[PDB]
Structures are given as C-alpha cells and as structure tokens.
C-alpha cells in the first residue's frame, strides 16, 4: 500500500491531533499579523539547481551562483533535502504544494502525482486559499508529463502554460543551452502578474535539466578530481547555465521590487544534476541530496534560522517568513518545521511524537478514513 497506518490511527486520535493544533493555532496566531491571501506566492522550482562548491572534489573556475548566494544571506534561506538524484522533480513539487512527506509514504511508491495524489478525495495544498483565477501553473514541456495536467486541472488552476498539452503557452521563447530558457520563464510570471489581485505561482523550470550543453562563458570551467573527460565536460556546460540562471534570477527579483504587490518567492533545486560520480562527494555523501534553497519578498525581509529543511517544509517556513496567521493543519506543519525535520534525529522521542501526529493527518488524507472531515476548521485559518 501507499502509506503505513499508524498503529494509533482512530477516530479518537485523529479527534485529539485536531483539538491539540486548534489550540497551537490559536496560540500562533496571536503573534502573526498577516494573513496568506494578502501576498502574491510563487513557488518557483529550479530544475537541477545546486551550488557545485558544496561537492567535495569539485573545483570551479568561477563562482556561478554570485547572485543566489547574495540573495541567500539576505532572507530566509539555506539548503534543502532533496529525496533524489538526477530526478524526481514531481516528487519535491508534491511535498511544496500539499507539506506532507514523501519520506513518510511507503517505499513503494515511486511517483507521488501518480500513485497517492488521485487516491485524495480532497487535497489540501497552499493554492487552496487564492480564487481559482488567480491559479497559476508553468512549465515547459508537456502539461502531461508526470500527470501535472491532472493535477493542476483537479486543484482548480486556471492557467497551466506548457509547451504542448494545454491551451496556454508561454510567449517570446527562447533556449538557452538546449531547453526554454529560465528568463522565458521569468518573464513569462512577470507578464501575467496582476497587482489588483492575489495569485499562486507554482513554475517548474527545465533549462538546466540534463542533457546540458554551452560553450560560454568559455572562461567557466569546471573539473572534478578524477572526473572522466566526460563528466567533466557535463559539470563545464551545467556550471556555464547556471551562470545565465544566476542573472536571471537576480533580474526576475529586481523586477518584482518594482511591483505594488507584496510577493513572496520560495525558490529552490529539487534535486542535484545527475552527473557526478558518487567519488566526487568524498565521505561526505549527504551532499548527494542537498540543494539550495532561499524565500524572498520583494518588500523587507527577515532571515529565519531554517539551515537544512525538506521540500514539504516550505509552506509552513512560508507562512513564518511572511508572518502570516495559520490553520491549525499549519500550526503542525510549523512544529514538524521547527522540531520534527530532516535536520533532526530520526531516533529522537520529540521527533517521533510529532511526526506520529503527521503520520496520522497524513494518512488519514490519503488512503484512509477521512475523520477530518468530522473537524470543520483543521484546514481553516
Ligand atoms: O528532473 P526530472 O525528474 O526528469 O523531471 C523533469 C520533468 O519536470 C519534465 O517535464
Ligand atoms: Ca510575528
Ligand atoms: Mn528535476
């Protein structure tokens, strides 16, 4: 099956995890003084982003995340912990848009969007809080890769643009490197962003997915200690494309400065290229499945200390970034963020009890009985 029951899962448990985070809500909520609706939100997932430096034997000519690492010391920021290698896109974009773990399904199960998403009866996920209107997805390849067309169709979004599949399309398109650009994509949020009007991003780049190739800047060039000729070369052109990334990004941000909207971007690498040799990490293999991630408003910006996170972490770090009031679904997400997380031990009794409280709403949402439904203001602000 998709998921393990819990051995404590009842009516009556479920009944004890929702009064217990009604109350923590509350609690929060006295000291939040925003609300969600109120920002524009774009989750905005870089296909294969990941600083080289972090990889041990790597060695760049040049720093090619200037930008990015800027951005990163100025806001909540830090690395992510990525369930993949080379892959698993759709997985990381689940675990953003509905914060429930993928490390907490069964092994089984190999794709989220098509395994666990349709056996939902009712997700919750982020987007729930903004008008279907003001829905918006993107990607460029085709809307039906990994079931995203169903997906997004069945979470209510208006617009999906893609390269084939739907009936929206991204304007003015260009490649760099062999796949649509990142600035396409950039300014393809930038053009459809409406300040009279609260909207959800979620945008799945490709530009730097494999196969990677660029020839500038020539004087970007990357090797890693016994690399083959051609895993070398891989690193060069992905290292080159980061570079473009890099700009765009930065260019993406200053733009969004200059909209009378408050934004919020929660940018980040789902998973690192697939082209390094497991040699290149050098005792240090945790670094296979970190990437970079950072949360950035366009206005002022606190830095939250959330240094290792997962992907199913980012709306509850979303909602403290921006200060924003939680429902009590949240409230537990917030408390898996803090105290219950990838950066934590596994083996640790306040870890476990938080999670055996996850666990049980998260199986209960997915294949089980759907006693929430008998707790009308657990998804409820
Ligand atoms: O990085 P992967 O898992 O190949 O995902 C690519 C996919 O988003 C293309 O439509
Ligand atoms: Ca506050
Ligand atoms: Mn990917």
């Known amino acids: 099956g998709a998921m393990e029951k819990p051995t404590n899962y009842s009516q009556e448990t479920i009944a004890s995890i929702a009064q217990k985070y009604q109350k923590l809500a509350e609690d929060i909520n006295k000291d939040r003084k925003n609300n969600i609706a109120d920002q524009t939100v774009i989750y905005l997932l870089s296909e294969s982003l990941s600083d080289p430096d972090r990889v041990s034997n790597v060695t760049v000519s040049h720093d090619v995340l200037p930008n990015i690492k800027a951005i990163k010391n100025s806001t909540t920021a830090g690395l992510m912990q990525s369930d993949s290698y080379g892959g698993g896109t759709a997985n990381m974009e689940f675990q953003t848009l509905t ?19 349709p056996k939902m009866a009712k997700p919750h996920t982020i987007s ?106 891989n690193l060069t052109s992905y290292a080159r494309l980061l570079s473009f990334t890099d700009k765009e990004t930065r260019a993406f941000l200053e733009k969004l400065t200059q909209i ?49 996170i997962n992907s199913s972490d980012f709306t509850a770090a979303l909602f403290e970034h921006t200060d924003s009031k939680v429902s009590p679904y949240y409230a537990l997400l917030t408390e898996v963020l803090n105290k219950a997380s990838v950066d934590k031990s596994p083996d640790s009794p306040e870890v476990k009890a938080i999670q055996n409280d996850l666990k049980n709403i998260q199986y209960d949402v997915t294949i089980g009985k759907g006693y929430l439904l008998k707790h009308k203001t657990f998804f409820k602000i």
Do not use: C
């Not at 773990?101 to 998403?117: D, K």
């Not at 040699?279 to 950035?296: G, P, Q, R, V």
């Open 260 to 308: 009378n909207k408050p934004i919020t971007v929660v940018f980040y690498g789902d998973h690192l290229p697939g082209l390094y040799p497991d040699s290149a990490f050098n005792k240090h293999i945790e670094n296979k499945y970190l990437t970079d991630y950072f949360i950035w408003s366009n206005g002022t910006n606190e830095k939250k200390n959330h240094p290792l």
């Open 99 to 117: 914060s429930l773990p993928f490390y907490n399904f069964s092994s089984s199960v190999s794709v989220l969007y098509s395994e666990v998403f």
């Open 128 to 233: 729930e809080f903004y008008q279907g209107k003001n829905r918006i997805a993107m990607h460029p390849a085709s809307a039906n890769n990994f079931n995203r067309k169903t997906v997004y169709s069945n979470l209510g979004f208006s617009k999906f643009l893609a390269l084939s599949g739907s009936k929206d399309k991204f304007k003015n398109i260009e490649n760099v490197g062999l796949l649509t650009s990142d600035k396409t994509v950039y300014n393809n949020i930038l053009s459809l962003i409406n300040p009279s009007e609260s909207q959800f991003f979620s945008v799945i780049t490709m530009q730097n997915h494999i196969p990677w190739s660029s020839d500038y800047p020539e004087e970007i060039v990357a090797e890693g200690k016994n690399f083959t000729e051609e895993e070398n070369h």
